[PDB]
């Protein structure tokens, strides 16, 4: 009860990021995340016929 | 000690050796 009130007292002064800040964070991190997922997923997709043929 | 492109070449030649060894095994199983 007391800790939740002190935590929201901290969070009231926590400098929540603006939409112009949040857009750059998404456009960097999420697009890098999707690029990671595509670079990974291409390898795991291509290596299944490779693992069947080459074995 | 080791340059980074030497590490890349070592890794690519290593995976090429692993692939080619399976290929030699498959061709030897198909022919003999």
């Amino acid at each position: 009860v007391e800790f939740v009130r002190e935590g929201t007292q901290f969070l009231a002064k926590c400098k929540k990021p603006d939409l112009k800040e949040y857009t750059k964070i998404v456009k960097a991190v999420g697009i890098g995340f999707i690029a990671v997922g595509i670079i990974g997923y291409a390898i795991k997709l291509i290596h299944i016929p490779i693992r069947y043929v080459i074995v | 000690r080791v340059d980074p492109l030497v590490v890349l070449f070592l890794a690519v030649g290593f995976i090429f050796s692993v692939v080619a060894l399976h290929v030699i095994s498959k061709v030897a199983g198909k022919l003999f």
Binding site: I48, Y52 | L5, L8, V19
Partner: protein, 487 residues
């Protein structure tokens, strides 16, 4: 058998449908979803010659292809008619099992072991060559090699920097056929406004790379702590962009169409654009010799809109603490008042003092350079003979006076507000003070970081901060100022 590869073809279009549409669709949403005034951008194309414009000319599909693929493939999907868990994958049977299998393994092994090491090594060599400031490695070594053995015997000219600059390797990569002793004569023909021959295209590409090469040479020489090469380098940069040789009356040779021999013969007294605007609008035609009314209006409209700097309140600041103290990190903070060679002597006392002092708010004084960054870009420079459309730029360099050298890397800025220059204030001419709002006159801010910290000993120390106009021979700004270190 672990997997099945869908030999009945009910599956492999359906996977590649999503694999194509998830690539196409966001790109469709992207493409379907898709401060300063420049005067010289209109007048530059009217005086740039036809050869330079021909050189400038000489040097959504995937989406509609994807949708045409989606239509045919969805037609093929709709054409189709339709416990023990059996795993299978979407990829087709002939792709994996049949005669295309050795083709696929050969294509994979060749694609890996060739396309990754060869392209990664060629890219790594290409990226390892070019340095951080945009120049090649061995041309940077060539600059430092010509610049170390530079004894201080010979004074630097406008020709010696061309002689160093022709030895660049980035010109040899463009044209391996001919020697750098021809490159030097070619740049000399570019400065001296001479008509070249077969390699006129080569001259224009050489000047277009000579921009970045002179910035690289300026950075190397100015970090090297040798001021005379740096000052001459900015002078040769002026010389090459405006394509007029360095002369004491070069400031009005950079004007578009003057009669050169006529002005050198008749009147030698007029050296400065400011002294050029001393004469009347009708009288300037007989002196400048061009004698054509539309051409005279064009020359005076260009000579009005060249930028001339002038300091108001040039001093040092320490961020957060109003007094400079030993072992601190001050930054250069000078406020230029950009003029037009037509506006006679705005007094310092009539500045309303509200915009001179930097505000002492913490968000402002965390990094003071953001307030400089909010200023608009410098518009396109006038110079037609430089090939590419060129942003005007301001380069600065401090100088420790007791040594006579530079002490830090030169800062190149292009953030100034030229709304002081426009036709709204055309009334205020050299040939008083009535009916003008002083708050409309905008004072720019030049906040330059000091590379070394403030020294440890107390005492009056002197720096000399100069700014120079690239792409213009205008009235540059060269001042010295003190740091009253007091502890």
């Amino acid at each position: 058998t672990n997997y099945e590869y869908d030999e009945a073809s009910e599956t492999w279009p359906s996977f590649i449908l999503t694999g194509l549409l998830m690539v196409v669709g966001p790109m469709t949403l992207l493409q379907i979803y898709q401060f300063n005034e420049e005067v010289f951008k209109n007048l530059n194309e009217e005086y740039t010659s036809d050869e330079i414009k021909q050189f400038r000319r000489k040097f959504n599909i995937i989406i509609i292809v994807g949708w045409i693929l989606v239509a045919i493939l969805l037609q093929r999907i709709n054409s189709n008619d339709a416990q023990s868990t059996s795993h299978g994958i979407a990829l087709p049977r002939f792709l994996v099992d049949g005669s295309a299998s050795p083709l696929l393994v050969v294509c994979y092994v060749a694609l890996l072991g060739l396309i990754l090491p060869y392209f990664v090594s060629r890219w790594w060599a290409r990226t390892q060559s070019y340095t951080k400031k945009g120049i090649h490695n061995v041309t940077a070594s060539n600059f430092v090699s010509n610049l170390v053995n530079y004894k201080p015997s010979e004074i630097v000219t406008t020709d010696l920097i061309l002689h160093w600059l022709s030895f660049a390797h980035e010109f040899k990569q463009f044209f391996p056929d001919l020697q750098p002793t021809d490159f030097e004569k070619l740049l000399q023909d570019h400065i001296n406004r001479r008509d070249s021959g077969k390699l006129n295209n080569a001259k224009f590409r050489i000047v277009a790379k000579c921009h970045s090469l002179l910035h690289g040479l300026l950075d190397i020489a100015c970090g090297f702590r040798n001021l005379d090469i740096a000052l001459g380098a900015i002078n040769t940069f002026k010389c090459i962009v405006q394509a007029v040789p360095l002369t004491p009356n070069c400031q009005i040779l950079q004007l578009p169409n003057v009669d050169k021999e006529h002005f050198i013969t008749k009147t030698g007294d007029i050296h400065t654009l400011g002294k050029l605007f001393t004469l009347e609008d009708a009288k300037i035609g007989e002196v400048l010799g061009i004698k054509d009314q539309a051409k005279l209006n064009e020359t005076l409209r260009v000579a009005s809109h060249i930028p001339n700097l002038k300091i108001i309140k040039a001093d040092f600041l320490v961020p957060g603490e109003n007094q400079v103290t030993p072992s601190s990190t001050p930054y250069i903070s000078l406020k230029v008042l950009v003029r037009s060679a037509k506006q006679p002597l705005i007094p310092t006392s009539l500045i309303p003092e509200e915009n001179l002092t930097e505000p002492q708010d913490f968000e402002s004084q965390r990094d003071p350079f953001a307030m400089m960054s909010k200023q608009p870009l410098v518009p396109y420079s006038f110079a037609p003979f430089f090939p590419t459309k060129r942003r005007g730029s301001w380069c600065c360099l401090v100088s420790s006076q007791k040594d006579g050298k530079i002490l830090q890397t030169p800062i190149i800025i292009e953030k100034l507000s030229y709304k002081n220059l426009n036709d709204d204030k055309d009334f205020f001419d050299k040939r008083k003070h009535e009916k003008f709002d002083i708050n409309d006159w905008e004072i720019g801010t030049i906040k330059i970081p000091l590379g070394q910290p403030a020294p440890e000993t107390v005492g009056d120390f002197f720096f000399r901060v100069i700014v120079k106009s690239t792409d213009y021979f205008t009235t540059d700004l060269d001042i010295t100022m003190n740091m009253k270190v007091r502890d």
